[PDB]
């Protein structure tokens, strides 16, 4: 059940009556029992335990909380500045933090350089001429 | 105290340097700056940083995936490429089916 | 030449039937859970990306104001030629840094556990050891608590000159500079103009 | 009276010994953790060997084994794609041309 | 041409965020020097002979 319940136990929180229809989906896991010898670690680490350390993080988000601590001081120095919290630190720190740079600026300015500029610009180019 | 200060006075003054990179300070969160934003950061530590700096040699014999699978999933493509390798798998066989 | 069709084709075709064979189970859920990681892998980092990305404007350039303050502290001994250019702009650009120095002061004893701890709600265990680090420095400050109360009140007036020169210009230098890097994936040559205009539409691209 | 204040000052001197492993680790952790560093980028290698990601390397083979013994992944990841191209009429273009050219 | 190396970023967190609150460490150094100071405090008037 582990492979499917990972996709279900998150949905099962709002599928109490729909347990009786996802329980039939649970046995699709027992097909991969032989694979589960080496697929049990990522069976739960596929949707919900993968969005904590494996895919959502892959450890990258672990530090992305850690930095903002000291940064809060410069923010709060202008934050205790009731006339500068929305004008300066909210209007400059969060403008590139709200919607834009969530998945392409994971360092100062380089996450786009090595992945987006680096490979996401060049991943198609890798094969799309050779094949 | 002096024995402690010989091993503690450096600590407090130094630890303000990892204040912002406290992830780099703490063990369970230094990996992002040593693995995740590191497919080029590990170049100076090339011997140490084989995580993704060695992906080029890892695909040295895989010349299709040379400039494609080298530094992609290190930050953002570990969630998007995987969904599109099964369509590749099922369409490359259609490129094998043209031979068929 | 009867076997020349399936000899190369079945090398990956057996994986294809395996992918259909492993579709529902965990074998190919890696390709189908990431089918949801378009948003499932961006639910927890995104709220922490902002902490990293609100850090952008500050730990990259809003601290780069301290070159107006660090050079006077450091370069004045090793290098005299830059020393003449160290404390000069300090009288204007780092004049608020003297006020900001008090803003560093007031947080150590009061807002260290209130600001330097806020963006680590889930990372509370590790910050506490860093917090108790910064908090253990208040034990001698327990003998100098008088200066740690009226500093904020005096900084009310300094705040206006703390924001007019220090927190106005270089804080916005880094918000637009790093909005350029993302844009440069598909369009790199002219992205500098559209750093503040094409920043949100590129990540989806 | 001062000794009590001296003891409290001494208390902070020894209380910080609990935090003695707080600062120097930043340079230490940035290097010694290469086992997990390659592991997170080993699941990266799990993505690349897409001919094997659908069976095992997505869970325990590429994301785990390829970190310490990365030399194994050199052949474990190129083989399932260099054969992919080779069987994608890339290592036999002359046969495929003439087999169709005779057609 | 992957010639970018984000080690600067790893040090961007390190280069000058220390100075943005340069006085956090001095509070602790005061605590470490407190035992030196309190020992100096108790070696002031009668232990001046010491």
Swiss-Prot record, chain A:
Residues 58-78 form a coiled coil. Disruption phenotype: Lethal when homozygous. Signal peptide: none annotated. It is found in: Cytoplasm, Cytoskeleton, Spindle; Cytoplasm, Cytoskeleton, Phragmoplast. It comes from the Eukaryota. Belongs to the HAUS1 family. Part of the augmin complex composed of 8 subunits. The complex acts on microtubules and interacts with gamma-tubulin in spindles and the phragmoplast. Interacts with AUG3. This is AUGMIN subunit 1. It comes from Arabidopsis thaliana (Mouse-ear cress). The chain holds residues 19 to 149 of 299 of the full protein.
Curated annotation (Swiss-Prot), chain C:
Disulfide bonds: none annotated. It comes from the Eukaryota. Transmembrane segments: none annotated. Disruption phenotype: Lethal when homozygous. It is found in: Cytoplasm, Cytoskeleton, Spindle; Cytoplasm, Cytoskeleton, Phragmoplast. Part of the augmin complex composed of 8 subunits. The complex acts on microtubules and interacts with gamma-tubulin in spindles and the phragmoplast. Belongs to the HAUS4 family. Involved in microtubules reorganization during spindle and phragmoplast development. This is AUGMIN subunit 4. It comes from Arabidopsis thaliana (Mouse-ear cress). The lineage of its organism: Eukaryota, Viridiplantae, Streptophyta, Embryophyta, Tracheophyta. The gene is AUG4. The chain holds residues 6 to 265 of 423 of the full protein.
UniProtKB/Swiss-Prot annotation, chain D:
Disruption phenotype: Lethal when homozygous. It comes from the Eukaryota. It is found in: Cytoplasm, Cytoskeleton, Spindle; Cytoplasm, Cytoskeleton, Phragmoplast. Residues 69-92 form a coiled coil. Involved in microtubules reorganization during spindle and phragmoplast development. Required for gamma-tubulin localization during mitosis. Belongs to the HAUS3 family. Part of the augmin complex composed of 8 subunits. The complex acts on microtubules and interacts with gamma-tubulin in spindles and the phragmoplast. Interacts with AUG1. This is AUGMIN subunit 3. The gene is AUG3.
From Swiss-Prot, chain E:
Belongs to the HAUS5 family. It comes from the Eukaryota. Involved in microtubules reorganization during spindle and phragmoplast development. It is found in: Cytoplasm, Cytoskeleton, Spindle; Cytoplasm, Cytoskeleton, Phragmoplast. The lineage of its organism: Eukaryota, Viridiplantae, Streptophyta, Embryophyta, Tracheophyta. Part of the augmin complex composed of 8 subunits. The complex acts on microtubules and interacts with gamma-tubulin in spindles and the phragmoplast. Disruption phenotype: Lethal when homozygous. The chain holds residues 151 to 200 of 796 of the full protein. This is AUGMIN subunit 5.
């Amino acid at each position: 059940d582990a492979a499917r319940i990972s996709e279900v136990k998150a949905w099962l929180t709002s599928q109490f009556e729909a347990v009786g229809k996802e329980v039939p989906n649970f046995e699709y896991t027992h097909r991969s029992i032989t694979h589960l010898y080496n697929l049990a670690t990522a069976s739960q680490a596929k949707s919900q335990a993968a969005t904590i350390v494996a895919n959502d993080f892959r450890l990258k988000a672990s530090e992305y909380r850690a930095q903002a601590a000291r940064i809060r001081e410069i923010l709060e120095s202008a934050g205790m500045s009731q006339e500068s919290l929305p004008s300066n630190v909210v209007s400059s720190a969060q403008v590139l933090a709200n919607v834009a740079n969530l998945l392409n600026i994971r360092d100062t300015e380089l996450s786009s350089f090595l992945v987006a500029m680096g490979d996401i610009s060049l991943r198609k180019t890798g094969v799309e001429e050779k094949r | 105290k002096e024995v402690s200060a010989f091993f503690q006075s450096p600590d407090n003054s130094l630890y303000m340097l990892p204040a912002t990179p406290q992830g780099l300070a703490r063990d369970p969160s230094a990996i992002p700056s040593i693995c995740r934003i590191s497919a080029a950061l590990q170049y100076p530590a090339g011997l140490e940083g084989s995580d993704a700096s060695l992906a080029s040699v890892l695909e040295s014999l895989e010349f299709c995936l040379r400039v494609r699978g080298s530094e992609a999933c290190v930050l953002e493509d570990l969630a998007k490429a995987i969904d599109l390798v099964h369509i590749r798998q099922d369409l490359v066989e259609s490129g094998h089916s043209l031979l068929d | 030449q009867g076997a020349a069709q399936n000899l190369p084709a079945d090398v990956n075709q057996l994986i294809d039937q395996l992918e259909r064979h492993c579709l529902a189970p965990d074998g190919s859920l890696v390709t189908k859970s990431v089918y949801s990681d378009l948003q499932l892998a961006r639910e927890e980092m995104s709220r922490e990306r902002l902490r990293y990305l609100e850090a952008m404007a500050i730990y990259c350039e809003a601290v780069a104001m301290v070159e107006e303050y660090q050079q006077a502290i450091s370069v004045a001994n090793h290098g005299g030629i830059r020393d003449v250019q160290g404390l000069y702009p300090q009288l204007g650009l780092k004049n608020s840094p003297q006020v900001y120095e008090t803003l560093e002061h007031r947080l150590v004893v009061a807002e260290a556990a209130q600001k330097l701890r806020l963006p680590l709600i889930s990372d509370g265990g590790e910050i506490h050891e860093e917090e108790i680090e910064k908090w253990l420095g208040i034990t001698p400050a327990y003998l100098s608590y008088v200066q740690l109360q009226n500093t904020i009140s005096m900084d009310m007036a300094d705040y206006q000159m703390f924001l007019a020169r220090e927190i106005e210009g270089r804080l916005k230098e880094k918000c637009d500079k790093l909005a350029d890097a993302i844009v440069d994936d598909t369009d790199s040559s002219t992205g500098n103009r559209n750093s503040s205009a094409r920043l949100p539409e590129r990540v989806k691209f | 009276k001062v000794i009590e204040s001296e003891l409290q000052g001494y208390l902070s001197a020894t209380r910080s010994r609990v935090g003695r492993c707080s600062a120097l680790i930043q340079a230490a952790s940035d290097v010694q953790e290469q086992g997990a560093v390659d592991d997170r980028d080993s699941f990266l290698h799990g993505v690349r060997d897409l001919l094997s990601i659908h069976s095992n390397t997505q869970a325990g083979l590429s994301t785990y084994v390829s970190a310490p013994a990365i030399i194994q992944q050199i052949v474990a990841l190129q083989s399932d794609l260099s054969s992919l191209q080779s069987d994608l009429e890339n290592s036999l273009p002359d046969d495929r041309n003439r087999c169709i050219n005779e057609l | 041409r992957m010639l970018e190396v984000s080690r600067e970023e790893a040090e961007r967190k390190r280069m000058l965020d220390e100075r943005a609150n340069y006085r956090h460490k001095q509070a602790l150094l005061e605590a470490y020097d407190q035992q030196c100071d309190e020992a100096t405090r108790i070696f002031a008037e009668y232990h001046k002979r010491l």
